[PDB]
Design a protein around this ligand. Structure first.
Ligand SMILES: Nc1ncnc2c1ncn2[C@@H]1O[C@H](COP(=O)(O)OP(=O)(O)O)[C@@H](O)[C@H]1O
Ligand SMILES: Nc1ncnc2c1ncn2[C@@H]1O[C@H](COP(=O)(O)OP(=O)(O)O)[C@@H](O)[C@H]1O
Ligand SMILES: [Mg+2]
Lengths: 239, 378, 248, 232, 135, 278, 58
């Protein structure tokens, strides 16, 4: 049964690609968790910021990457593979803008990244990148958009999603959340994201242990909240 | 196109007004029009017109003649599909008219051709009709065989909700008739009720009735009320539902007075239904037997009058029932009509010794015959 | 074991992958070809005949390569498709270069050469397709050819491949008259041998497709027989069997 | 013969390419999909049931257009479906550029089957773990085909692939008639999916596309809801 | 909440009308106090905690089929009242297929008069299969 | 003197105190399967005169095949409870052992024990392990498993006609297994145990919940009418989980909310699914 | 004729199943239709049921 799990191109007798599943398991090897919530007029990503050393430059530990002035991404999994996929996505966005004039939709960013991942899955040349990408962007005529891209090459839009070690619990908490109809304001969206992360981690969430990226209809620019804004959101959440 | 619609609407209005001779004349007059139109359309129209003619209560006796003349017309025009449709509806009419023997004959003479032809829906309908008339003729094994054949053919085609509901009805009826397992009869009746409800057909209420009847036969009458207060059952709540409710209440209270009162009140809904009437009579007889045994344990020489007072029936009915139980090797005792008593005793075993002694006497009678076969050699 | 790769010689000098492809040909549907005076025909069984399968190509086993050539097919579906397309390409390249139809045999050799390549170069599985060729040219007239997954080919007058190929070839050996066989007799022989080889009885026509090749006023018409003529061929076979029953 | 289940370029001693059969098993373990051809056109329906409400139903569409008159649904792996869709669209555009006429359905099916075959003729590359059901309309006639990872394409009148495909086929041959219409086709396809659909058919849980004379169009969720109400 | 009801109040299950829950998996890293928790609750109810040390309780072990079943049943529950555990905490939770079928046959469903409560504490979550997730 | 035969549990030999205590009443809605199994292994041991009258040699082997958790093992239990013969229960995993030649030895020992304690019924449980197709074997393990299958075939229908014993087998697929085992001589009857439908599911719900406290507002039909394809094991799991949910909230009467929660919990069977196989 | 190439034990099974139909109908005789449908039950063949697999070999 499990003797077919050494080459990504080998189908198991049950029709399962085990190497892709192993990349999915490697997604959790980063040890962190990221949650994305799409509000009525904004999208928000919050990721764990684990700096287990006073010597690290906390500025460069960021897992939030700006793929394009309007499209932001949060990475989960191995850091090197995630950064490689980030540069690939940035190059794809630049190529789209150069070849078609207008800015690439987040739809196409995740679609192209998933296509590259699938090509790596079908041709046994490169090991699949065990990094999950979550892209947020204000796509005109559709509002905010949040998309998730996996090592398998399956890209999907989400009202709210999560990735990392605590993915099932965060997704369950969000599923409990997005069901009770509510005014998904920007503050409400950040509140939902932070509450998801705190509930699944049971952490008091000092402002330096998390990173928040924000895109809004009012300003369709990928913005990373400063520590003061994180503190303000946390104290608003507590009361 | 216009002519067909006008004919069908005129037939519907006439059936609403009920002029059987006029409808028959219209059907005869539209016969030349059938050749001028297509085949399936003409079959659909003839089926609709005959259904409208037959549905009304104008039991003038010309229904069978009209069906036979339609069949002879179809044979003249060699329209086999419509011909088999007329035969199937004629079998149904014969079954509904209590003319079971000719229904059986027509079904038997048609089933061969309907097996040859691939129209398996008509074959399923005819097999169900054969099972129905066999059950109405008390030939339970043959009805079960016909129903099983109908189910085997049904699990090879798309059964419409009406056909599936009829299938479940007949399966539940057959299972109820064989009084050995009532849970599956209840399940099949519930399936038929759901299927009939999905199409808002009238027979759905009958299904409900049978389900309630089933819930009484597993001596769990309370659920009958719980079945009446169900989402699908509120719509069908009526006189029949309250009839079965009070019958279930009488069964729960073990009261034959209440049982007879319920039977007398809703005589239209408890005696006009052969299945309901038969099963309720069986249940009443069993309840009478059980109560008679219950009130007979303490006494030894109680009079019939005291038992009649205890169980609240007539003296003659109690005496006849007691004689039946005594004759049928039920509770041991002998009635003394001279003074009025039913004595009870302990039925001495049989004295196995004497029976074995008789067997040994027979055995050595055989041995003596064998010795008579011997001793011929001097 | 010496069967992991197509390019590994067994210690006895046997290419086990090639033999595996040859034996795998037996899984393919029965397709038969008979040569006869002024004609040459192929017949094939439709195999998968499910009622929900629309029949829109009408030639799922018979293909027309050139103007005066046709081929049967028995093997992997994809390999058969690519082999037939490449046969058509070779024939059209020859026609473009020489402005003359390719003389049958050469075409076979051409395709066969390519098949041989897949049995020699590494990293390529042998073409698990064997196919019959019928044709006519200006050199040897009507010709019937047999191909193998190994790329070996041979001229034949009557031969079959696929399911129950041995029984069909034995029946053809028994009931073939060299020199004095016509198109009608060849069709009757094909029908009877298909009936005997196909385990299904009465040999229902829609389960069998027959394509004939005949020369008509210098036009080398290639016909695929519609169902209607196969009905009357089956009826003819049934009535001959009934007449042969008269001996009892 | 487990020793021959790894190489895509190695015949088993029984002459079976086992890896292609494993790809077909992966196909059969996919989401149920049905495709039925009526005298008015073709209908392709599929179950787009997400794992949770979080997934955006309208983000990705399973039933996709290839040309104005050709549509195509799938059963099997998801990511390979997009690659096959892109290659089918590119082949259609190439045919249009060469011949100035929209590609016939049979020709597109043949070219797509060849493309799928290209991934089964070499080691180190995996066969497309998806099966394609392609609808088209040409010459006043509906066309429905199924292309497989093996590169084999047939001309299904009515079929179902994916989970409980045997149940879908068994439901067919009963509710399917060659003289139906596009509306009856839609109803029959929805019922066939209902035979293998777990839960309520929410309008966002089912994707249906119609290949009629006017071309191929994926049904909007409003029409899907209307048809579901007409059926249930 | 999982165990005290079968010990203290077995009659509530009859009140509702359901067989007591047998398989309770306290899965987690070894050496974190799983058996310590079990001994703590056992001492809270002073019930004899017969943790399985394989010998006289091995069931799935394919060396012997039914004699091992006999030892599993008779040694515990019958002789010693109740409260069981198991060793090789992650071995059976994770011929291997036949071993799993025999495990399912061993554990499937037994008489509740005699307690063979399988409080397992497997060390890892990935060492599980859906064949055991049934209540 | 001669001591009385000391025949005991031996291998299994289900004793009168070891009956599974499951009756046909405890089974909800397996009418066709119940009828076939009763005609095969219960009717011959009681009403053999009918078989002699027709002269048909009543069957010796039946196999129940269907999705797991559909009631095959429980039906075997019910047959065991309501039998007058000597029941023997064994799974197709206890046969496969180390020390080659113990599997076939176990098979022949079981069949000899059944012959000695005639009449007897042997319920061979899950059999996909050893009944698989006898393809060309090239290893010791393959040779031994095919040896086990061959011994099973020889014991079931061989030179030594057993007579007065019955063999019952269970399988999930029935597409596998050697045609020699599926021979009409060996396994005469092949009963299918499909997933319960709207009818069978209603009977299963009524049977399982006929013991539970339930409540007036609990309408099982709302759960029967759901189009989800769930098995009898799933029905039992739903009922037990609903009862546990009611108990946890300290309630002696099962309400509809806990039923809905348990049904939603049990229905969820995707787990991960990796969302690309689908 | 209705048994095209059985095993011989399948014939005995056919007779046994015809007798079983007679028993289930509580009769002692056996009819021709009974024998034919018993043949149909005993001749139960398991096809591939996957046209994708069957169409691999053209
Ligand atoms: N909560 C705790 N308090 C005190 N000691 C503990 C606690 N948890 C674990 N320990 C210590 O760690 C060890 C736990 O081992 P245990 O979890 O029983 O391993 P296993 O479950 O594999 O037998 C014991 O030796 C115990 O002394
Ligand atoms: N018809 C039914 N009525 C009541 N309970 C059932 C029914 N079918 C299955 N079950 C429940 O599901 C379980 C099935 O167990 P088992 O017989 O081992 O399944 P299988 O034999 O299919 O593996 C039983 O414990 C029983 O409680
Ligand atoms: Mg079981």
């Amino acid at each position: 049964s499990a003797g077919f799990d050494r080459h990504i191109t080998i189908f198991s007798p049950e029709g399962r690609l085990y190497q892709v599943e192993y990349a999915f398991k490697a997604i959790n090897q980063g040890g962190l968790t990221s949650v994305a919530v799409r509000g009525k007029d904004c999208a928000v990503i919050v990721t764990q910021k684990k700096v287990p050393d006073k010597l690290l430059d906390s500025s460069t530990v960021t897992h939030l990457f700006k793929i394009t002035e309007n499209i932001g991404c949060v990475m989960t999994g191995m850091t090197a593979d995630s950064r490689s996929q980030v540069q690939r996505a940035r190059y794809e966005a630049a190529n789209w803008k150069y070849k078609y004039g207008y800015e690439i939709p987040v739809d196409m960013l995740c679609k192209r990244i998933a296509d590259i991942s699938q090509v790596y899955t079908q041709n046994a040349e490169m090991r699949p990148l065990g990094c999950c990408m979550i892209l947020i962007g204000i796509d005109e005529e559709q509002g905010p958009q949040v998309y998730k891209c996996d090592p398998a090459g399956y890209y999907c839009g989400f009202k709210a999603t999560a990735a990392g070690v605590k993915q099932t619990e965060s997704t369950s908490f969000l599923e409990k959340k997005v069901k009770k109809k509510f005014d998904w304001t920007f503050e409400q969206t950040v509140e939902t994201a932070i509450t998801c992360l705190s509930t699944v981690l049971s952490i008091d969430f000092k402002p330096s242990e998390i990173e928040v990226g924000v895109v809004t209809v009012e300003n369709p620019k990928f913005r990373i909240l400063t520590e003061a804004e994180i503190d303000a959101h946390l104290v608003a959440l507590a009361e | 196109q216009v002519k067909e619609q006008s004919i069908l609407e005129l037939g519907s209005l006439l059936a609403k007004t009920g002029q059987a001779a006029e409808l028959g004349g219209l059907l005869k007059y539209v016969r030349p029009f059938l050749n001028s139109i297509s085949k399936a359309k003409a079959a659909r129209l003839v089926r609709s017109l005959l259904d409208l003619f037959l549905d009304m209560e104008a039991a003038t006796g010309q229904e069978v003649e009209l069906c036979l003349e339609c069949i002879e017309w179809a044979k003249s025009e060699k329209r086999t599909f419509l011909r088999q449709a007329l035969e199937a509806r004629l079998v149904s009419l014969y079954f509904d008219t209590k003319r079971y023997q000719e229904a059986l004959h027509l079904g038997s003479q048609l089933l061969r051709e309907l097996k040859k032809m691939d129209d398996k829906a008509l074959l399923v309908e005819v097999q169900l009709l054969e099972s129905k008339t066999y059950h109405a003729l008390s030939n339970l094994p043959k009805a079960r065989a016909a129903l099983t054949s109908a189910r085997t053919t049904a699990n090879a085609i798309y059964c419409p909700p009406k056909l599936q509901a009829t299938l479940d009805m007949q399966s539940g009826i057959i299972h109820a008739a064989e009084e050995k397992d009532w849970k599956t009869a209840y399940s099949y009746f519930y399936e038929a009720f759901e299927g009939y409800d999905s199409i808002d057909s009238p027979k759905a209420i009958t299904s409900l009735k049978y389900m309630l009847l089933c819930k009484i036969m597993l001596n769990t009458p309370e659920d009958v009320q719980a079945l009446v207060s169900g989402k699908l059952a509120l719509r069908y709540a009526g006189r029949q539902t309250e009839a079965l409710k009070c019958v279930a209440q009488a069964s729960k209270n073990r009261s034959l007075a209440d049982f007879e009162k319920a039977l007398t009140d809703y005589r239209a809904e408890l005696r006009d239904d052969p299945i309901i009437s038969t099963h309720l009579a069986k249940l009443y007889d069993n309840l009478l037997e059980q109560n008679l045994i219950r009130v007979i344990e303490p006494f030894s020489r109680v009079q019939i009058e005291h038992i009649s007072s205890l169980i609240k029936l007539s003296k003659a009915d109690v005496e006849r029932k007691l004689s039946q139980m005594i004759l049928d090797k039920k509770f041991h005792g002998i009635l003394d009509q001279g003074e009025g008593v039913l004595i009870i005793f302990d039925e001495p075993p049989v004295d196995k010794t004497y029976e074995a002694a008789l067997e040994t006497i027979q055995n050595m009678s055989k041995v003596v015959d064998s010795l008579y076969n011997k001793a011929k050699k001097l | 074991r010496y069967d992991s790769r197509t390019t590994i010689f067994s210690p006895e000098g046997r290419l086990y992958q090639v033999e595996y492809a040859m034996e795998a040909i037996g899984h393919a549907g029965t397709c038969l070809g008979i040569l006869a005076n002024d004609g040459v025909l192929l017949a094939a069984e439709r195999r998968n005949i499910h009622k929900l399968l629309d029949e829109v190509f009408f030639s799922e086993k018979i293909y027309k390569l050139n103007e005066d050539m046709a081929c049967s097919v028995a093997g992997i579906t994809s390999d058969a498709n690519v082999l037939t397309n490449e046969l058509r390409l070779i024939a059209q390249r020859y026609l473009l270069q020489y402005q003359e139809p390719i003389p049958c045999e050469q075409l076979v050799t051409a395709l066969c050469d390519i098949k041989q390549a897949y049995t020699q170069f590494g990293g390529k599985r042998p073409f698990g397709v064997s196919l019959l060729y019928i044709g006519w040219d200006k050199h040897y007239g009507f010709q019937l050819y047999q191909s193998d997954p190994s790329g070996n080919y041979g001229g034949w007058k009557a031969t079959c491949i696929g399911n129950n190929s041995a029984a069909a070839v034995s029946m053809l050996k028994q009931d073939y008259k060299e020199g004095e066989m016509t198109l009608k007799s060849a069709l009757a022989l094909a029908i009877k041998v298909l009936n005997k080889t196909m385990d299904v009885s009465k040999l229902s026509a829609e389960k069998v497709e027959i394509a004939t090749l005949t020369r008509e006023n210098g036009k080398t018409v290639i016909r695929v027989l519609k169902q209607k003529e196969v009905e009357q061929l089956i009826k003819k076979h049934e009535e001959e069997e009934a007449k042969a029953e008269r001996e009892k | 013969e487990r020793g021959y289940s790894f190489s895509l370029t190695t015949f088993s001693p029984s002459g079976k390419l086992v890896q292609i059969e494993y790809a077909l098993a992966a196909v059969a373990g996919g989401a149920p999909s049905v495709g039925i051809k009526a005298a008015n056109g073709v209908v392709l329906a599929t179950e787009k049931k997400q794992k949770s409400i979080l997934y955006d139903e309208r983000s990705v569409h399973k039933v996709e257009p290839i040309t104005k008159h050709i549509g195509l649904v799938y059963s099997g792996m998801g990511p390979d479906y997009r690659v096959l869709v892109h290659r089918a669209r590119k082949l259609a555009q190439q045919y249009y550029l060469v011949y100035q006429e929209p590609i016939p359905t049979a020709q597109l099916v043949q070219r797509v089957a060849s493309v799928m075959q290209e991934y089964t003729q070499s080691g180190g590359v995996r066969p497309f773990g998806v099966s394609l059901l392609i609808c088209g309309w040409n010459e006043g006639r509906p066309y429905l085909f199924q292309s497989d990872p093996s590169g084999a394409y047939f001309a299904w009148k009515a079929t179902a692939m994916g989970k409980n495909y045997v149940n879908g086929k068994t439901f067919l041959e009963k509710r399917y008639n060659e003289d139906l219409e596009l509306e009856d086709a839609i109803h029959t396809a929805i019922l066939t999916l209902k035979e293998s659909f777990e839960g309520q058919m929410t309008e966002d849980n089912i994707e249906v596309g119609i290949c009629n004379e006017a071309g191929f169009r994926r049904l909007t969720p409003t029409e899907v809801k209307d048809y579901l109400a007409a059926i249930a | 909440e999982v165990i005290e009801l079968p010990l203290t109040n077995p009659e509530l299950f009859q009140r509702v009308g359901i067989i007591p829950p047998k398989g309770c998996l306290l899965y987690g890293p070894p050496g974190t106090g799983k058996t310590l928790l079990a001994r703590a609750v056992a001492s809270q109810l002073d019930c004899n905690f017969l943790k399985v040390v394989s010998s006289s309780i091995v069931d799935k072990y394919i060396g012997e089929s039914a004699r091992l079943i006999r030892e599993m049943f008779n040694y515990a529950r019958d002789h010693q009242p109740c409260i069981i555990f198991m060793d090789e905490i992650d071995a059976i939770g994770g011929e291997i297929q036949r071993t799993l079928m025999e495990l399912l046959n061993q554990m499937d469903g037994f008489d509740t008069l005699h307690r063979v409560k399988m409080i397992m504490a497997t060390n890892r979550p990935d060492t599980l299969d859906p064949a055991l997730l049934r209540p | 003197d001669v001591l009385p035969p000391e025949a005991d549990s031996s291998i299994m030999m289900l004793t009168s105190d070891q009956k599974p205590d499951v009756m046909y009443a405890d089974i909800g809605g397996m009418d066709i399967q119940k009828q076939e199994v009763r005609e095969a292994v219960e009717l011959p041991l009681t009403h053999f005169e009918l078989y002699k009258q027709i002269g048909i040699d009543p069957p010796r082997g039946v196999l129940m095949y269907g999705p797991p958790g559909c009631g095959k093992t429980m039906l075997a239990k019910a047959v065991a409870h309501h039998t007058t013969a000597a029941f023997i229960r064994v799974v197709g995993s206890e046969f496969v052992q180390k020390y080659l030649g113990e599997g076939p030895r176990m098979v022949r020992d079981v069949f000899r024990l059944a012959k000695e304690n005639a009449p007897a019924i042997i319920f061979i449980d899950e059999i996909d392990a050893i009944a698989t197709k006898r393809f060309d074997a090239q290893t010791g393990a393959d040779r031994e498993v095919q040896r086990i299958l061959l011994e099973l075939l020889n014991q079931m229908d061989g030179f030594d006609q057993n007579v007065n014993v019955k063999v019952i087998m269970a399988t999930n697929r029935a597409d596998t297994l050697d045609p020699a085992l599926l021979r009409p001589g060996r396994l005469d009857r092949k009963i299918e145990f499909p997933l319960p439908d709207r009818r069978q599911k209603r009977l299963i719900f009524s049977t399982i919940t006929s013991k539970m406290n339930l409540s007036e507002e609990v309408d099982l039909e709302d759960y029967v009418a759901r189009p989800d394809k769930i098995s009898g094991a799933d029905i039992n799991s739903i009922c037990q989980e609903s009862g546990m949910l009611a108990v946890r909230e300290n309630r002696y009467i099962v309400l509809a909310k806990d039923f809905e929660k348990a049904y939603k919990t049990v229905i969820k069977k995707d787990e991960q699914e990796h969302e690309f196989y689908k | 004729e209705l048994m095209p190439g059985a095993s011989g034990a399948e014939v005995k099974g056919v007779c046994t199943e015809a007798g079983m139909y007679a028993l289930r109908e509580r009769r002692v005789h056996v009819t021709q239709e009974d024998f034919e449908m018993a043949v149909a039950k005993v001749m139960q063949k398991d096809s591939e049921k996957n046209m994708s697999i069957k169409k691999l070999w053209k």
